[PDB]
Design a protein around this nucleic acid. Structure first.
Ligand SMILES: [Ca+2]
Ligand SMILES: [Ca+2]
Ligand SMILES: [Ca+2]
Ligand SMILES: [Ca+2]
Ligand SMILES: [Ca+2]
Ligand SMILES: [Ca+2]
Ligand SMILES: [Ca+2]
Ligand SMILES: [Ca+2]
Ligand SMILES: [Ca+2]
Ligand SMILES: [Ca+2]
Ligand SMILES: [Ca+2]
Ligand SMILES: [Ca+2]
Ligand SMILES: [Ca+2]
Ligand SMILES: [Ca+2]
Ligand SMILES: [Ca+2]
Ligand SMILES: [Ca+2]
Ligand SMILES: [Ca+2]
Ligand SMILES: [Ca+2]
Ligand SMILES: [Ca+2]
Ligand SMILES: [Ca+2]
Ligand SMILES: [Ca+2]
Ligand SMILES: [Ca+2]
Lengths: 305, 303
RNA sequence: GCCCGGAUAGCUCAGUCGGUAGAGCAGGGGAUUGAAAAUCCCCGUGUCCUUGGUUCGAUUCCGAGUCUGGGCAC
RNA sequence: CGGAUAGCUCAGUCGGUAGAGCAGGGGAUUGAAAAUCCCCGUGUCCUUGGUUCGAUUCCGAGUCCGGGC
């Protein structure tokens, strides 16, 4: 049984992932899938570094523009959509090339996800209510009583995972620990994994500052103003929490100056890149490609496949 | 001589913030000194104190005029005097707060008795000037009043028109009439200027405050005024900062990004002229905007 | 020119009743199970502007100098 | 094929260190004042070589742009 093959092209923001995948498209029989939590949103184009129409004509990207910014996506939704796209592409005699910087998604796809309940807004509101009356420390104390192992790993000041560990208990009566000893299904594909990134760190920062000011001149403020104008989007939504968009949101709310927006936008982008690189340093199977050398990058992929 | 307080400062200075904190300590009644806050239904764009601030502190001379009605420094003078007389006859001290320095000037020093606007006579001067240019009218003024001709520049249509208007209605020239004076205040006044530490900080708070009001439904407000059908660019209300730019946006003359840019610029420039007024103002005590604690304390002492 | 204030970490600034210092932000490392561009954890780095006076000891109090921001004067 | 000069859009130096609008700064202010006016400039002329007493300018070469196959 020959396991079908796929390629992961990962990397930080401003690393030229999109550039290289579109070049790979010309010489390898591949179909591209976006692995990015922000490129999935309609009308969020400039700030997300979405490939434009002409780039999509030459190299179609699946899993772009499948959500309105008011709606939320998940590692799980990605996994289900990604698996289903990977079966079509394979059934057409092609090789799925998955490209993006959203590393939890790659991980969810590669090693599985344990089956668990999905979000419950009502249960989430309840927990948020109690945090506001008694602090998150009371909630972490509750988790100590029901799920000691989850309590130890999850820090008292991590609202997101604290809410998540309790939620799973409230919905099903079983603890997060209990459910996650059932393991995720591994990806039934032979996968070649690459991570392309700038030679050094000083240079990663330089390209990020450049790519931010590039966006500003591309009409980024206008894009975010349209979103801002709708009236039904708010900073608790994943899309508005995106890098660039969140700081521009403060700006449009009159909470910071233009220069403070610019400062905090770039910083958030550097902070993104840094966390993407952390994932990649601990990742297993990675072939490293040099961002500032796209020609060798292309040839290195070719001769590893 | 009964006493009074001037609290003067540029836009985005925390005037109202301080006024409401003074109202808790000294026995005092606020009077708004502002060419724009007089107008009904112009609330967001003008930085009008909200209905909550108005409950803590009553402000007089707010929302006394429909936007189709021109106010004037003389109308302010009459109303402020009449209101000071109530506050004084009621045991309290008038605290006039705001950023319209000509209005403060007229009140303290007095205006000389002249004729008011005659719109027909203004119609003829604006008609003559379109046919014969603004130099010929200036020439006309030099022939009959040399002194104002030397002071009023040929490219200043408002003051030139006014100088000629005073003569056309009266027969007496502006110089002749401005020889009689005010009518200064019969009050012992304590004058305060409240401004930020630096010009960069003032600019930055101005940008911020303008985006604040956009996000609070400023365009909807101006849409309502635009809805009416009787208001136009020659009215004092629609020439206000923010409102005038939003007016061009609503006429389809400029984009939204352009409206925002010109609005911020127009508000920076307003603030600049406001502190030009205050620099050199006699007897004024300066206060820092960013130090509200130290601010309040200096006022309490001086009085 | 005169008067007032500021000067301390890569940035904003707190503080040291005179015993040579710490917050946020930036930067570094790490965690990561249906919000992940999210949410968290851990770690840095000082001629305390210069100089003189008082002092056992001064970044701190005092004087002077320099740079910066205001006001006043033109 | 083109463009790179002020915070922004740009003009200009027949080779001798540069203006225009806008922004910005200073000023005036007598019934429209959030109005109406007046005054002032903001400089590694992208980098590097060549030619030159002198190059931002002329001529190469680099780099970034925006356009044409
Ligand atoms: Ca003055
Ligand atoms: Ca003066
Ligand atoms: Ca230093
Ligand atoms: Ca500093
Ligand atoms: Ca300090
Ligand atoms: Ca001590
Ligand atoms: Ca940090
Ligand atoms: Ca000594
Ligand atoms: Ca010393
Ligand atoms: Ca000292
Ligand atoms: Ca100064
Ligand atoms: Ca330019
Ligand atoms: Ca040119
Ligand atoms: Ca010449
Ligand atoms: Ca010049
Ligand atoms: Ca100007
Ligand atoms: Ca006068
Ligand atoms: Ca100069
Ligand atoms: Ca040269
Ligand atoms: Ca050249
Ligand atoms: Ca091209
Ligand atoms: Ca073409």
């Amino acid at each position: 049984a020959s396991l079908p093959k796929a390629i992961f092209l990962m990397g930080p923001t401003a690393s030229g992932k999109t550039a290289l995948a579109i070049e790979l498209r010309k010489i390898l029989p591949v179909e591209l899938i976006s692995v990015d939590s922000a490129l999935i949103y309609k009308g969020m184009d400039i700030g997300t570094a979405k490939p434009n129409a002409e780039e999509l004509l030459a190299a179609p990207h699946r899993l772009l523009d499948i959500r309105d910014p008011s709606q939320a996506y998940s590692a799980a939704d990605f996994r289900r959509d990604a698996l289903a796209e990977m079966a079509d592409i394979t059934a057409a005699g092609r090789i799925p090339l998955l490209v993006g910087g959203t590393m939890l998604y790659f991980k969810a796809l590669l090693e599985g996800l344990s089956p668990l309940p999905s979000a419950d807004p009502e249960v989430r509101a309840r927990i948020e209510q109690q945090a506001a009356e008694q602090g998150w420390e009371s909630l972490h104390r509750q988790l100590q009583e029901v799920d000691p192992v989850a309590a130890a790993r999850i820090h008292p000041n991590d609202p997101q995972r604290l809410s998540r560990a309790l939620e799973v208990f409230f919905i099903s009566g079983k603890t997060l620990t209990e459910l996650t000893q059932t393991s995720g299904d591994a990806l039934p594909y032979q996968v070649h994994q690459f991570a392309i990134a700038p030679a050094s760190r000083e240079l990663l920062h330089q390209r990020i500052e450049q790519r931010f000011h590039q966006m500003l001149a591309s009409g980024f403020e206008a894009e975010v103003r349209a979103l801002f104008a709708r009236g039904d989007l708010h900073t608790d939504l994943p899309s508005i929490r995106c890098v660039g968009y969140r700081q521009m949101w403060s700006y449009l709310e009159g909470e910071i100056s233009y220069d403070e927006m610019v400062y905090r936008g770039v910083c958030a982008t550097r902070q993104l890149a840094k966390r993407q690189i952390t994932w990649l340093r601990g990742w297993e199977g990675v072939h490293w490609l040099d961002s500032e050398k796209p020609e060798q990058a292309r040839d290195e992929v070719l001769q590893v496949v």
